A paper describes a structure:
Chapparvoviruses (ChPVs) comprise a divergent lineage of the Parvoviridae ssDNA virus family and evolved to infect vertebrate animals independently from the Parvovirinae subfamily. Here, we report the first structural analysis of a ChPV, represented by the fish pathogen, [name] (SsChPV). SsChPV is a pathogen of the gulf pipefish ([name]) and is a member of the exclusively fish-infecting ChPV genus, the Ichthamaparvovirus. The SsChPV capsid exhibits T = 1 icosahedral symmetry and is assembled from 60 copies of a single VP.
Particles purified from the mixed SsChPV-VP-BAC+SsChPV-SP-BAC suspension were vitrified and imaged to resolve their 3D capsid structure using cryo-EM. In spite of the low particle count, we obtained the SsChPV capsid structure at a resolution of 2.93 Å. The SsChPV capsid structure also displays the canonical eight-stranded jelly roll core and long linking loops that are typical of the Parvoviridae. The wall of this opening comprises three α-helices, donated by the GH4 subloop of each subunit.
Author numbering:
A (entry chain A), B (entry chain A), C (entry chain A), D (entry chain A): 1 to 80, 88 to 356
Write the structure that this text describes.
């Protein structure tokens, strides 16, 4: 099936604070001023009804592609009194298919779909900016200042978004078929069981929450650390939960969704000061997911606990994304990221 | 190549003891009365000569498909005096390709091929019945009583076996190529060896026994537990051998052989009592295995220790299935399930 | 791209010291007298400029095939006075595509490309001979003496190299696409990071050296030991670094480069003594590697630390092969074998 | 099926020591200097794996043809210091299809297939020479000196083998279909039984050994002695085991494999002394055997006791060739030569 969700966001022309000239830092970090379209987690693509349509009555699903269309550019200027006029300026759209930029920082209650007018809970929905860091290896003596990432170095690949009835599209296609079960629990072999020998036990990834889980996990490195790092057993990373529990191999994408960058063109005046030009944009996040319909030999539908909208007075409401918790299917790969699961029945001593 | 083995077994019409109405149990288990055709292990498909033909003079093999034909239905009634007459009744044949039913419990000396007349060691060869369990996740509050598995809910997929010259076929096709070596031992890299550095050592899965080993291992969950469960190090399942040693990844099937269910139609009298109708059936278990012939540069054939028929006076005879123990081939995946292996030469301190 | 390197080496007709007739040894080892063409590591195929052309300006590469042509056979006899005459004799060329022979022992500064005249640092470049070992499993009682490897048992597959303008070619083709990044470092997920939560850290395989690293790693067994061996936790192999850190799964070849065997025909006189016939051969090692060009959005090229030629007075010079150490790409598989890596920034407590 | 085995042997140019001029002997014997290719027994054609492939899973077999290709002639001269040069000389190859030469003397552990390099257990594999004997009948007064066998008398049928890339082929085709069972034991008629009347007993040729048994027995004369010789009962030959037990009539070949003769050309110097020229030759012994596959109605394969490799410390290893010892088939001819058999059950008084 295919999900499409539109909302309004704001972008600016913050200048690229090019790599620091001062004292050298091994992870040399700087602000690029480029806004990053949120395209990593499920909540960045799906409303709760989209998630329910995805999980309900389907036994497996796989992500086929993602797409974002930025359109209806309405530029705004403030005389620091808010003029809605600009014609010549444009936005810079760049897709990092080189995967040389840092992954998106986790969003804290993005919830851009409950407030689609551009004012999320009484605050302007300004897109998050990207802060780039330059990491050289420890042994090398290269100066990081020379290796600053800049899409203008690949300006032949930069698309521009003019104001008005114009649209710039970001596109991603899955180059691998990663089918995920919609059920959070599977059976063990009676001969190869963690419970009572020659008896049936079930492991279940508990209900948890999938709004902030990556649509493309791509956590391959975590599994590789335990395979390639020859540090002694007293090393710090061996006790880290990320290294210990990397995530299912058949669940991570080799070519995940890249970072999508958009930015108003920065302009400077005679006093070497950036003149600020904000713009409203209609962001249409679209996700394509292939599904296999579910045909279980039962009378009931598996509908409860899939979504749980939580709201308390004066607190920001939110709805959790969850999988089917009722019946285990013993074929397919568990979909949820590494989280504390349970065993049914509980293991003995 | 292709293996076919026929034998006679018996089935009944035990009623489906639908989910318990009484006190709720998280693994709500009940008897479905459905007989399960043994189709999981090697001994369910292969006689010792079939196993020897499979392993001898082949360097690799892969399971292509499995098939079971149930025919020559001879129904019997007992006046609790054994009438061999029934014409209208029929059997219910259902294949669980949804993989929502528990895996087959291990067979204790099934040995249905040494006694093919229907009387295994002076006991009627009645097929094993399936006891279904309903596992919901711990957190959910769903009542398991409503989620009882029943093929009559998918009665459009139920095939029927009439008595007489009739046949119902169960079919399974491998959707993945899982090639397994016929040799139980391989070499290490001299640069990446567990023994003496820059020296040759060999790991060998010992002779063991493969009669009860799954033809399609499908033990994927065991490897996933160590990748997704974020329980603390003191958790019970971390010390379980099943979790610690899951089995070779390249050895497990993603779409293994499903459970095949057959059942006489249950009938009830005025006193609400099941009237018992037993039937003899000719079961023809068939397995297709692709093989690559072996062309080693040696003078001897690797024939010993492949099968070891054990018989002691007054004890039930049995023959063990084993792989080629003589020469290691350093390419391909070891075939045997996780079992205590040896190193040649033994590792130093 | 495609790399070709020619050099001169020497081969002899050392007789096959067939399996020992004396006291039995479980790893029964003997000298076969067959010379083994060095074809396992990068330095066996690539000069430093070839390695730099491979790594520089490429973001990924995969090994497509390897080839060795042995030609210009000039046989020599010594009257133990060095006659360069022989016409009827020939060499025996055999490829072990059965993978039943031990892997090549690590070469100690092979460096056959700096001295291509046949005299490496004032020593004749005689090809290394193969010592074959017969490993049976511990439990079996088979005599290893009967299972000696000998290509004359497959003499229908032996190619012969006549002296003069003649050539015998060894060929290997990769049957799997194993793409490797040219960068030694990748980013972590902020949500699934070993460092500060919701913050960016990088794992980096340090610079190390890749001259002696396998062009086809094929270290699958090491990862399988932790999946199939059910020995108790106090077993010797559980603390071995090879078992603990097997290497990246997506990095090992299922069908690596086999051993290539060449040997002068052995001849014996009336006193049952081998008459020694040495021959000079022109060895042309050729490797085909597919590459994807690198198009990073940076101004600098990543050129330093890729190769570091080390020379000290009166010590044999050597050049190290290394990957790109400057910029991490978060897609693809790390290329280097298991070696002590670093984290940027360093992990906290 | 078809068996091919290659190995290296040595031949010389020993002069034909033409019939003795001295005192006359009725069996006038002399050395012809012609090397005889071993082509009479099973071990001259089959490795143990070839024998196992022949006997296992086959109920009958017949010898179709035999072939020997002598090639890769490398001549050697010793200055009684071992020169590998000769171009003009050649070998003389002659096939005795007249069957006028003595049959091959039994080989004492020929075992040329375990050591195929030309040095069998630290001794040069020189081919056995043929010593011809001239037998006239007792009554006749012909001088045997005039009837010396010499292929130069039929030099139009002599093939020559030049050194280098040249090959001379010996060929034999069976002109009769002699099918032999692979089972060493058969049933008797209850009406015509040596045991209890109207009861079942089995005669079994015991396991014994078939490495030195003729591939073509051709022992017709032994059976004819008891049919044509009218000597009195006190004659010496009536108590000989060869006459008493000739061998199965349906087992002997009327046109067996003839003697194959090869010889370096003899050359003489001014002092009437033979100048010795030894040559290495690649002997490729090939045997074609038709087989009928075995389809017994049993579960086990008949694999044990077929071959028994015997090795003791410091003693030359050897493997015995044997037939199927488990199940008697009551049709076909027993394959083994006359040897002490057993009866099951044992005969009463």
């Amino acid at each position: 099936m295919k999900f499409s969700n539109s909302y309004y966001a704001y972008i600016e022309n913050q200048k690229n604070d090019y790599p620091d000239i001062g004292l050298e830092r091994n992870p040399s970090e700087y602000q690029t001023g480029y806004h990053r379209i949120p395209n990593q987690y499920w909540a960045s693509f799906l409303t709760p009804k989209d998630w329910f349509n995805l999980i309900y009555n389907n036994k497996a699903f796989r992500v086929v592609g993602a797409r974002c269309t930025v359109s209806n550019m309405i530029p705004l200027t403030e005389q620091a009194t808010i003029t809605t006029f600009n014609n010549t300026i444009y936005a810079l759209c760049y897709t990092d298919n080189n995967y040389e930029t840092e992954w998106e920082e986790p969003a804290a209650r993005d919830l851009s779909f409950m407030w689609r007018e551009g004012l999320t809970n009484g605050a302007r929905h300004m897109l998050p900016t990207y802060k780039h860091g330059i990491y050289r290896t420890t042994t090398s003596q290269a100066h990081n200042v020379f290796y600053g990432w800049d899409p203008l170095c690949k300006a032949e690949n930069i698309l521009e978004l003019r104001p008005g009835k114009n649209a710039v599209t970001f596109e991603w296609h899955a180059k691998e078929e990663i089918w995920l079960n919609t059920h959070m629990m599977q059976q063990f072999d009676p001969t190869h069981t963690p419970g009572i020998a020659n008896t049936a036990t079930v492991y279940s990834q508990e209900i948890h929450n999938q709004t902030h889980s990556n649509v493309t996990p791509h956590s391959h490195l975590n599994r590789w650390i335990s395979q390639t790092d020859t540090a002694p057993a007293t090393a710090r990373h061996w006790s880290k939960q990320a290294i210990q529990r990397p995530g299912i191999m058949e669940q991570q994408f080799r070519y995940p969704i890249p970072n999508w960058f958009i930015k108003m063109i920065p302009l400077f005046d005679s006093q070497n000061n950036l003149i600020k030009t904000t713009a409203q944009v209609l962001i249409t996040m679209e996700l394509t997911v292939d599904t296999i319909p579910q045909s279980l030999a039962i009378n009931m539908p598996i509908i409860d606990d899939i979504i749980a909208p939580n709201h308390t007075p004066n607190s920001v409401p939110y709805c959790m994304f969850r999988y089917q918790p009722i019946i285990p299917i013993n074929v397919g790969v568990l979909p949820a990221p590494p989280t504390k699961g349970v065993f049914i029945p509980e293991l003995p001593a």
